Ligand binder design. Structure first.
Ligand SMILES: [Zn+2]
Length: 363
């Protein structure tokens, strides 16, 4: 047993606290104890983070773990390993498993599997409708009480506006978001219903300038609408890039989508170097990049993660923004390989991931 850990010599960035600079972090018994220039205490393990960025552990709010149902493509274990290698300490799994996440048995399965794997926290979402069939609303209260943090029929958009409106009403009562998603009309419908219900809607896919302008319209009017983009897809790509620059897009989300034969691509391990390309091209600041992986996704799902506040669980990611590497058979932790980044030089690499004060990944 080791009780204390010092992360020394790193560049700490914690946007939730407007904190940034060359600081050490003292972790004691799994929680953040002190952040200061220079810390040294006896009987501590020391990580030397010189030349690295130290930030809250990343949160990935759109992952397909294919478990249950298609576990030859990915499973909770392999997806969890991809996630911590990518710097993520918390991942949110989508409910289009087989069977789908529409009852408490499936929720329990995912939570028990995740506890047995012991790498990142896996938060389940539930379906909006029973069987994702689009007709009959699921039991949100029971699903939420079992652990679901959001609801979506992901895979297939909810088509009936009356179903979406009911879901947003129930969601508003429970304080959780609905995740959704011809594109432009659906986003407008969701914003309008979010405004009328007081519900929070998260838009999972935006591909056009008009879509971004509509979202920004709703955000300016104070509607609880947020959206995401997959950094791996950024390299209407140019319109998306402007949306990121202007702050319309709240968060990066991988949409890790394992396949073995739009197209969905795997993404957990490459999210960071992809995002860092936007930083190197001057599209976003480093602080904004970290926000979009930490505090912003944390706020979208309403969890007290994505910070380095004192007393918080010590979920910490430590990365080298300039380290070149390649996603290939030597580094891939997924059961699938479906990404146009396969075999290409990436720049930016997680070096350590720490969850509850324990090193769960090391480069
Ligand atoms: Zn999806």
């Amino acid at each position: 047993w080791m009780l204390k850990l010092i992360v020394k010599n790193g560049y700490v960035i914690d946007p939730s606290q407007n904190l940034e600079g060359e600081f050490d972090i003292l972790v004691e018994n799994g929680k953040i104890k002190k952040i200061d220039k220079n810390i040294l205490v006896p009987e501590a393990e020391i990580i030397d983070a010189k030349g690295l960025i130290v930030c809250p552990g990343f949160i990935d709010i759109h992952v397909h773990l294919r478990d249950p149902g298609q576990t030859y493509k990915e499973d909770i274990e392999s997806g969890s390993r991809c996630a911590v290698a990518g710097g993520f300490t918390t991942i949110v799994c989508m409910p289009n498993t087989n069977p789908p996440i529409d009852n408490t048995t499936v929720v329990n399965y995912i939570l028990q599997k995740s506890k047995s794997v012991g790498l990142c926290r896996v938060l389940p979402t539930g379906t909006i409708t029973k069987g994702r069939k689009g007709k009959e609303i699921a039991d949100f209260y029971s699903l939420k009480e079992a652990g679901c943090v959001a609801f979506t029929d992901d895979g297939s958009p909810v088509m009936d506006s009356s179903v979406m409106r009911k879901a947003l009403e129930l969601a508003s009562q429970l304080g959780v978001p609905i995740m959704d998603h011809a594109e432009e009309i659906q986003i407008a419908r969701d914003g309008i219903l979010a405004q009328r219900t007081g519900g929070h809607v998260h838009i999972q896919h935006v591909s056009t300038k008009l879509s971004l302008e509509i979202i920004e319209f709703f955000k300016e009017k104070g509607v609880k609408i947020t959206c995401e983009v997959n950094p791996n897809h950024l390299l209407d790509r140019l319109a998306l890039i402007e949306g990121v620059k202007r702050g319309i897009i709240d968060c990066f989300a991988t949409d890790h989508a394992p396949h073995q034969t739009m197209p969905g691509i795997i993404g957990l391990q490459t999210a960071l170097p992809s995002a860092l390309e936007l930083y190197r091209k001057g599209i976003i600041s480093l602080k904004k990049l970290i926000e979009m992986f930490t505090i912003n996704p944390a706020r979208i799902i309403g969890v007290d993660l994505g910070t380095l506040k004192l007393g918080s669980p010590a979920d910490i990611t430590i990365f080298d923004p300039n380290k070149e590497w390649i996603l290939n058979e030597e580094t891939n932790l997924s059961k699938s390989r479906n990404t146009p980044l396969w075999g290409k030089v990436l720049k930016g690499k997680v070096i350590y991931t720490i969850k509850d004060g324990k090193m769960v990944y090391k480069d």
